[PDB]
Design a protein around this ligand. Structure first.
Ligand SMILES: Nc1ncnc2c1ncn2[C@@H]1O[C@H](CSCC[C@H](N)C(=O)O)[C@@H](O)[C@H]1O
Ligand SMILES: COC(=O)C/C(=C\C(=O)O)C(=O)O
Length: 299
């Protein structure tokens, strides 16, 4: 979304308040990946969310590059890199579209060089077909493509908040109209309508996980497929700070037509307290997201 390129998009709050990804998932990715480790490119990298994690959580790469359209996001990524130089000595950031690999050099762009391409919490914004064709043109043989993301969390132990987990994001009088489409609908549906092309990728692996399954011992026991479990301990304040990082929230908050309305993130806190009056706003509780991933090896 162009929202994340706004000069005043709060990329610092994105970095502080957005979820990152668990070691078990990275271990799975490394078990999937075969072969050399010269170059990892993380497209749509944001403020280095997955990029900086991968420097530590995967086996070493000679170089890791995060690319993104947003200068705002890349600047934050660079700030974090510079804070731990190093830990991140082999990580660089580039302003580039997810299908533009010109930063590889005139002699390497579109010449099937990269070992692994990741696209994390962003591929719903892409023309998926155009993106996968570019990835194919930019991966070495049997190079990995790994796409993953998340949406629509619940609090497993607080089913009283399930209605808020609909109304906060999707209230018809609130944030609902502000989600950009079709990206939001694609994300919510776990990119189920977009497929790695079997002419371009093989050993294709797909997973889907509904966070409500955490409430059901049978469903957890019977998963066929190593789900991505994005579980976090958050206070109500921290969850509200995550709301404040949403693209839809940025747009809602800045729309002059909403100037006299109660802030939606603040409303979340107030309404949660009304539903669970024993809960303090600094008590940690578990939140879990719906997730997906798609893995392929370049043919
Ligand atoms: N076509 C495109 N090419 C590259 N980046 C894109 C893009 N469309 C959207 N983006 C970027 O997608 C990012 C989504 S938010 C950052 C997601 C981050 N990878 C994470 O794991 O949380 C934004 O920074 C936005 O600028
Ligand atoms: C980078 O985040 C997303 O693309 C999805 C999203 C929010 C979310 O589902 O947490 C948004 O702000 O657009």
């Amino acid at each position: 979304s162009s929202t994340f390129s706004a000069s005043d998009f709060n990329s610092e709050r994105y970095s502080s308040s957005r979820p990152s990804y668990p070691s078990d998932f990275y271990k799975m990715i490394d078990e999937y990946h075969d072969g050399e480790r010269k170059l990892l490119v993380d497209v749509g990298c944001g403020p280095g969310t997955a990029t900086l994690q991968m420097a530590q959580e995967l086996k070493p790469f000679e170089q890791i590059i995060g690319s993104d359209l947003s200068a705002t996001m890349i600047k934050t990524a660079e700030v974090i890199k510079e804070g731990s130089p190093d830990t991140y000595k082999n990580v660089s950031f580039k302003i580039s579209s997810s299908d533009d690999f010109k930063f590889l050099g005139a002699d390497s762009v579109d010449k099937q060089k990269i070992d692994m391409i990741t696209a994390v919490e962003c591929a719903h914004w892409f023309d998926f077909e155009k993106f996968q064709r570019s990835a194919y043109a930019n991966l070495r043989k049997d190079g990995t493509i790994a796409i993953w993301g998340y949406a629509d969390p619940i609090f497993p132990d607080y089913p009283e908040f399930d209605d808020l987990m609909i109304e906060v994001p999707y209230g018809k009088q609130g944030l609902g109209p502000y989600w950009e489409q079709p990206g939001r609908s694609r994300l919510r549906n776990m990119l189920k309508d977009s497929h790695l092309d079997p002419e371009l990728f093989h050993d294709i692996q797909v997973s889907y996980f509904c966070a409500e399954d955490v409430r059901d011992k049978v469903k957890l026991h019977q998963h066929t497929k190593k789900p991505l479990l994005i579980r976090k301990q958050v206070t109500l304040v921290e969850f509200a700070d995550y709301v404040r990082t949403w693209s839809a929230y940025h747009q809602w908050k800045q729309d002059p037509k909403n100037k006299d309305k109660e802030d939606v993130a603040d409303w979340f806190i107030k309404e949660s307290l009304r539903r669970r009056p024993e809960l303090s706003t600094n008590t940690k509780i578990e939140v879990v997201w719906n997730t997906f991933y798609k893995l392929g090896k370049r043919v």
